[PDB]
UniProtKB/Swiss-Prot annotation, chains A, B, C, D, E:
Modified residues (N6-methyllysine): K84
Name of this chain's protein: Actin, alpha skeletal muscle
Positions where Methionine (R)-sulfoxide occurs in the chain: M44, M47
Any Gene Ontology biological process: mesenchyme migration
Residues spanning the signal sequence: none
GO molecular function, one term: calcium ion binding
Organism encoding this protein: Oryctolagus cuniculus
Subunit field text: Polymerization of globular actin (G-actin) leads to a structural filament (F-actin) in the form of a two-stranded helix. Each actin can bind to 4 others. Interacts with alpha-actinin. Identified in a complex composed of ACTA1, COBL, GSN and TMSB4X. Interacts with TTID. Interacts (via its C-terminus) with USP25.
Encoding gene (name): ACTA1
Family designation: Belongs to the actin family.
EC number: 3.6.4.-
Principal place of residence: cytoplasm
Amino acid sequence: DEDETTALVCDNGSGLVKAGFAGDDAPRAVFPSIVGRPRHQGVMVGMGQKDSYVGDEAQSKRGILTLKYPIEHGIITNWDDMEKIWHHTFYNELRVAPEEHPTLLTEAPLNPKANREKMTQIMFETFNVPAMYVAIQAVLSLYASGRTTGIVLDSGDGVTHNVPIYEGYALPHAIMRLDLAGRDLTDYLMKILTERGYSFVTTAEREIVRDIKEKLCYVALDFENEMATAASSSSLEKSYELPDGQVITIGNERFRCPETLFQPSFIGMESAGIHETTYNSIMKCDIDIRKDLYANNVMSGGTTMYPGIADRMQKEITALAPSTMKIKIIAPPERKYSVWIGGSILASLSTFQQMWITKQEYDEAGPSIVHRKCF
Amino acid sequence: DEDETTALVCDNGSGLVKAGFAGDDAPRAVFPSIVGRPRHQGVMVGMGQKDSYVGDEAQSKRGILTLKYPIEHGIITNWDDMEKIWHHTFYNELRVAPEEHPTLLTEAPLNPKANREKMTQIMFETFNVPAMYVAIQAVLSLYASGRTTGIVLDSGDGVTHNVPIYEGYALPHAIMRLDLAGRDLTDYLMKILTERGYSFVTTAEREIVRDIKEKLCYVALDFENEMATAASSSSLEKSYELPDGQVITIGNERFRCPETLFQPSFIGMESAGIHETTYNSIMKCDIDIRKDLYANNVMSGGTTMYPGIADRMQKEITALAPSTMKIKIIAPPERKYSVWIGGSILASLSTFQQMWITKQEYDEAGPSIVHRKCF
Amino acid sequence: DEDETTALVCDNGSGLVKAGFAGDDAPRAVFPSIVGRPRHQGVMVGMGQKDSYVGDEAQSKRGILTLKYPIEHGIITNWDDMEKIWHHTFYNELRVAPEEHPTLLTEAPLNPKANREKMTQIMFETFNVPAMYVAIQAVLSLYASGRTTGIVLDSGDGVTHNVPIYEGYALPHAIMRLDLAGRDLTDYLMKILTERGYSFVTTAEREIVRDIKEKLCYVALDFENEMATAASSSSLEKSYELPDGQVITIGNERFRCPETLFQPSFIGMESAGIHETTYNSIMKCDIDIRKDLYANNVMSGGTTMYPGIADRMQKEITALAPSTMKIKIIAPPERKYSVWIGGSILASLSTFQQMWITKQEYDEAGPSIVHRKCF
Amino acid sequence: DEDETTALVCDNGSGLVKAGFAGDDAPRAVFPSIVGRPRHQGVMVGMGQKDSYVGDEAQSKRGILTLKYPIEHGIITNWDDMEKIWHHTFYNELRVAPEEHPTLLTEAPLNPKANREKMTQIMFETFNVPAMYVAIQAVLSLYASGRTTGIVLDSGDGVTHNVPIYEGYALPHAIMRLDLAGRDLTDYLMKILTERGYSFVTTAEREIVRDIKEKLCYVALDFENEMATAASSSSLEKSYELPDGQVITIGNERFRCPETLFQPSFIGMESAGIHETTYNSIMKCDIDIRKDLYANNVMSGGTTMYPGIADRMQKEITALAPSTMKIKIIAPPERKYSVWIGGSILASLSTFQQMWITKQEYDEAGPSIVHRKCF
Amino acid sequence: DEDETTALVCDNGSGLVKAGFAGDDAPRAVFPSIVGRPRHQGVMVGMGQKDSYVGDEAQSKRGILTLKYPIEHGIITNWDDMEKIWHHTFYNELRVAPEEHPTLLTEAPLNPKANREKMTQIMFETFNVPAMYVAIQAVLSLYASGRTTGIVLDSGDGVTHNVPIYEGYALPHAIMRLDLAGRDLTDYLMKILTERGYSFVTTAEREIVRDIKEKLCYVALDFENEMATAASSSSLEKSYELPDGQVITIGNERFRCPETLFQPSFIGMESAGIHETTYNSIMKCDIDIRKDLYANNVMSGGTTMYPGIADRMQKEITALAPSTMKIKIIAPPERKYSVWIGGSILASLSTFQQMWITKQEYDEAGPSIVHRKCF
Ligand SMILES: Nc1ncnc2c1ncn2[C@@H]1O[C@H](COP(=O)(O)OP(=O)(O)O)[C@@H](O)[C@H]1O
Ligand SMILES: Nc1ncnc2c1ncn2[C@@H]1O[C@H](COP(=O)(O)OP(=O)(O)O)[C@@H](O)[C@H]1O
Ligand SMILES: Nc1ncnc2c1ncn2[C@@H]1O[C@H](COP(=O)(O)OP(=O)(O)O)[C@@H](O)[C@H]1O
Ligand SMILES: Nc1ncnc2c1ncn2[C@@H]1O[C@H](COP(=O)(O)OP(=O)(O)O)[C@@H](O)[C@H]1O
Ligand SMILES: Nc1ncnc2c1ncn2[C@@H]1O[C@H](COP(=O)(O)OP(=O)(O)O)[C@@H](O)[C@H]1O
Ligand SMILES: [Ca+2]
Ligand SMILES: [Ca+2]
Ligand SMILES: [Ca+2]
Ligand SMILES: [Ca+2]
Ligand SMILES: [Ca+2]
């Protein structure tokens, strides 16, 4: 605060920017990292009072907006708009200057080497920031839950990761990366929706595709066995008159799309489901290591909030794995803010001082300060 | 030939099947031991005229194939496909029956005891083969070059070996084995390629990873000293517009991956570089033995064809070793066929008759005929 | 104790540090002389609460440790770590100061002359120790059992020894030394394990190799005769589903490795089995001496705890030896602590005062005090 | 020669077979009576062109050989190999048939009665030899130097002897025999080498032990006085970087092993040094006999070629002996061939005809012909 | 006894100390006059409970002892140890003080004049002894058998003597002395044993040489005639598997060593056999004296207990001697204690009082008391 650093806590992504102060219970400032642009065109006298629709203000009015997606995988299509997105975070909501407090961000595992410097360059060289540290997505969720060892599969929208963690951080061998996250599932629904009679192609309806999914589509216990169950007119058929002006008879469609996550074969790829890669990464490890990896299967993120997600991991895991320990998927009561809570503690402890990167340190070692101190 | 044995010469592996007749200069039949399977899916009217893509026919069209890898380390994932691979060798290209000529194969050092019998079983018990002998990979390369004593480090894709050889064959004491060969380097590139902005994950691009490496990536003389040299924009930066439709700005990446071979630390293991193990195996031997081991350091295989491979062995070897003899890595003009030439002579000499295994000998002593005669 | 000497009893080695107080029945403090180092690498926030893993704390968690072996034969690879190992013995477990009590250690027969002074130097010159004496490994086991004459073959991990003992101590003539102990057997298993299909190469699995051996591998009565017995599917084949997640079908492997102890030919050496050297050392002695050497064949150490060890010495000994006395291998009910019990008595008797080395005696005769008083 | 006898000259032993023609200056054919056997094992295609390595051909390549020692004291471990050793002497090097020339050999003093007949049996009964005579080792060295009276101490490898000689040959009373020769010193070095940190145990390094000794180890003038001199860092400390790849810091070790020859106490025996037995054998003789025994102390053999051997005999002899004559050890310029020169003359003179044993004489008196004519 | 003299009876030598009380049948205390010293060396904790091994205690354990021979001919190598030998006789076994009883010892014929006084000096001047008398070895054996005239050849270990005895004691003229006794035969066996293949050189095997002789080696009736008999494989060849662990094929060796006694020519001397000197001493005497000398040829001592000793004296004596009387060697049933029995009577009779030397008599005439009273 003015006369002292005092850092904030932020978990930026391509879905929700979880920013807030220190010592809170839930994120105060939240909005999707997306900028809207007028598509209606024409002239203006009484406009919507916005030139570049952003966040909640943008997501609210979709009809007139052409949602520009900055962070599309990890690569940013354009950095020019990112500058205004950050100008909206500090000055507007938080109402605090960036030339005052440090900044705690999240690191999308295996992000281009140029981004690490490019991002920090916008803070330190451009808008003089006292300090900043970009922690590694998943690792934070471990301490928040109160664990110190297990296997964390933190996936959101950008990318997918299988990170087995121990008291000592893992190494490039058991960990994996895959480009089959939420955004891939969102753009896939429209594809399979054509066989029934739906076509949410354009932008204003591209978001609706995401909306119908989260609050209805359930995951099947056994796709192959429930496919024939579709004949039974009782458990599936349920007219859901969308409270707006349309009926969406979702029968065999409810568990046809979610299966794609575990069955990319419906897309046209070689990559096996995320439950096959789970075996691949574990089976390689030494014999005297797996026993505790199954004891605590950590599954965090919004991807793990679909009605009926743990039950599926009761047959798939037990199949190709030892049978000595008890199996159960751990999904904390509040798994969504798993990353936000963990970062709050580190930003509160004074011991963290001997880790972060100080302002002057950047200038004293140029842009290479990053890879010069950390890895 | 029909009325007489007359053996062939084959050096099978997981990269190139070097088969041909006797008295030739170069291998006639060559193809990778890999089978492809359709991944595009759908229906067929005018197909690619293949049910199980194999060898050159397979490697040619990667886009539609899901390259099934039979020989993955030494262990074969599946033997059912191996039967067709051998059905393609004799009948198709060579156009000669296996019930006619013997067979000279190579032995992957320290291969499971069951394989020795299992392989021969497919020849003798299944497709009646007059005779066969499976010689030991490296030893053949020694006579081909015209040497009788030295240290041969024959490595390809399957496994790595350090075989010091003398007039009398070595013994389990100085020789070593390691699972850090080409295939480990091929699957590693994609890992470190993510820090820059590349992700050749799926199969159709898994092979491209191998292609870019061999015809560009050079080996550094001093990694630690050339890492800082990266700042110099002249010796590294060279836009290589891949003749297809993409630019691959390889600067510090050219000598970052090759170093992994000698620096597994970048992976996450304990195993030291293959140049450390070289010391380990030699330093144990008697004092009055090393002087000639350095005089002729044999380095064969495709692994020893990277621009700038001998220069590195001029500082590493001389460091922890006596300084009495002259040091120089011997890489014959044609080191790739080092194994093929050596086997050709043995398959030509009539004196070899008192060594190989005859057809009936297998039936007269059951499957144990192998370990019963040889070791 | 503070106002008086009162010595402890220690039997240090490269396997178990048998330390404890006086007047006990079993060793209180026990741990392997090995230090672990993080190999997982990365960063730390909630570490394993250890910088240099040691003893039980180290052996417990192998996955993250790179077991540094200090005492590797007798020669110590590095003395810098040995200082902390001894700092862990007194202060932590025993909770007694070294500037208070003497110290009773064991002497690895035929240890470098420099070590005798180097070791004592760390006690007397560095951490002022009132007194210390380093007794000779085997001799102690003789009195513990309650014997005064026979032939003791005390072997553990460091080195092998054949020490015939009489009321008057032996002399360099019948005694022998050999570098073919446990550590040689431990590192050998991985070698022969490759013919079947196992490769416990790296460190985290190097220890597992030692674990599977001790609690399963039995010793054959007649290797050459039991090799053919392997055909019989009843006495060997027994699926041992390792309680973890893997099956280890040990058939002819159970008695293939143990035979190497008595048959180094499987390695590639000239040294005959330890049962041949037994003849060599005895056959030289006078004619009127052997009769009592066979009457009591002492065999101590963990090496003599494999199911079926005495039976083998019923044919090998009787073969090339007189046939007048009764033959039987003496392995006391508790042969493991044979050295610990013997040293306890000497450390209890007050008559021992006229033997040990006093603190000041070291300073009054410099470092040469050792060879100046004793030999 | 074919149409006539004409004898050769041979001085066979367990170190060098000094064979050659008559009228030469130095031995033409020389090699150690040792046979080598492959220990590397495995298979063969380009072998070392030898089944039973012998002599120079064997000593050259030690690494692959398991040096079989035929003549081990006097007793021959095995006679079957001795047959080939002699087949190598005549036919190969000399290129002359044994059924043509006699044979002059040496007699190891006090050799089993059976050997005299057994050896001759292989020549006369097996490979019809015209004649042969086996003269007594030392006596020959007397005439070669040109002396007719004195005390000869001819020792090599087999056994030690103190033979006082006069115009009339000595008698079993002053002469002595002892089993403390070179071979005992060679196998002793490895014993005392363990206190420093060396262990040349196996065969390939057993010979190296003999090599380091002869060309470095010097003999002390006063061991007890030079033991304290070790403190002086100038006369002893001299880094001898063995031209191969190892440093052997020999300080107090140079004169510690040689002393064992004169001080068997370091081994564990009762036998006094060879300089004590010298007194024992002389002090018994009559009073009017010693005066000339000291005047000419003959010391021949390779044992008397260590830098500083005569000086030691200047204090030890003068101590317990009369002081009337001048004392000086006589070691001819060429003392190594002392036995070869003496035998050459006897094999040249025609007067020798009335001494040797003729072919038919053996058959006319059976195998007992030896003890029937000579003693 | 305390209040009165009462003498003991002792026959000390270098083989057996025959001591005991008066009125007994056999000697109670018996042991060889030899002291042992540790040769094994090293350190001690549980020693053999002896600093100076003596007598039975010493002879029992030879392996660790360096048998010190005090009385070596007659001359004592060292008197310092003799003091303890006598301290062991009275105090330990007999449990009686020397300041209480006289002492009856034996006199080695022709012993140095200084010894007579030196010995008595240790008794009278040092350990106040009431009285003592040193009788002449052989003369005692005469009365024991019950004879009063003949020729006694009493030989043991020290020296040889030919003592013709009559009612009146002999005189220096017919009597003789020779240094060719048992000890000379014991040290000779090892010499001739080398021609066959034995070498019992060191101390621990020096005694074994004496052991094998007494209980096997027989004496030939006619050496020259039995030498050829060796060819006959029936009367000689008899495998005597020494009950310990070795075979000693004694054929012509059984009667080769014993002959040396009568044929010193095999050694290298001029002295004729003890049967030639027998003639020499008798042929000189008057003509009218020999007739009774042959009638009773007394032969006592352990030397006359070899199977077949009298038969030899049936041809040798009758050869060069008158043929009027009957010839027969007299060897009493118990000839070993011939000296002990004779001395017992003299020590029992009260008439002996007027002969022995009283305590005070020594002080009243100084050390010369011996030659002053007796001769
Ligand atoms: N209750 C829910 N059920 C299923 N998906 C949800 C739920 N709430 C949010 N999501 C989804 O989670 C994703 C955002 O998760 P988040 O962890 O913020 O991603 P990122 O950090 O990669 O931007 C969006 O795809 C959103 O639709
Ligand atoms: N010119 C080259 N430079 C570098 N690597 C090469 C070259 N040519 C071939 N290779 C590589 O060598 C390997 C095949 O070598 P090979 O000896 O046939 O192996 P294997 O016998 O183990 O199947 C492949 O990894 C291939 O990419
Ligand atoms: N029950 C057992 N059976 C076989 N080996 C055993 C047993 N218990 C311990 N060992 C082995 O004994 C060795 C340790 O013995 P120890 O006498 O302490 O050796 P050192 O003193 O040389 O360190 C280790 O190799 C260990 O695996
Ligand atoms: N220059 C030398 N100095 C010391 N020892 C030597 C020398 N040359 C040879 N020897 C030794 O002499 C011995 C051979 O001597 P030799 O008289 O031939 O013996 P033998 O006749 O008993 O076989 C070997 O031990 C050898 O190492
Ligand atoms: N039964 C026996 N046969 C042959 N020699 C024997 C026998 N018993 C003892 N001796 C020998 O007799 C000698 C001892 O005789 P002894 O009369 O006591 O001698 P001394 O009095 O000279 O000491 C020893 O050499 C011993 O080996
Ligand atoms: Ca996420
Ligand atoms: Ca290869
Ligand atoms: Ca031990
Ligand atoms: Ca010699
Ligand atoms: Ca006697």
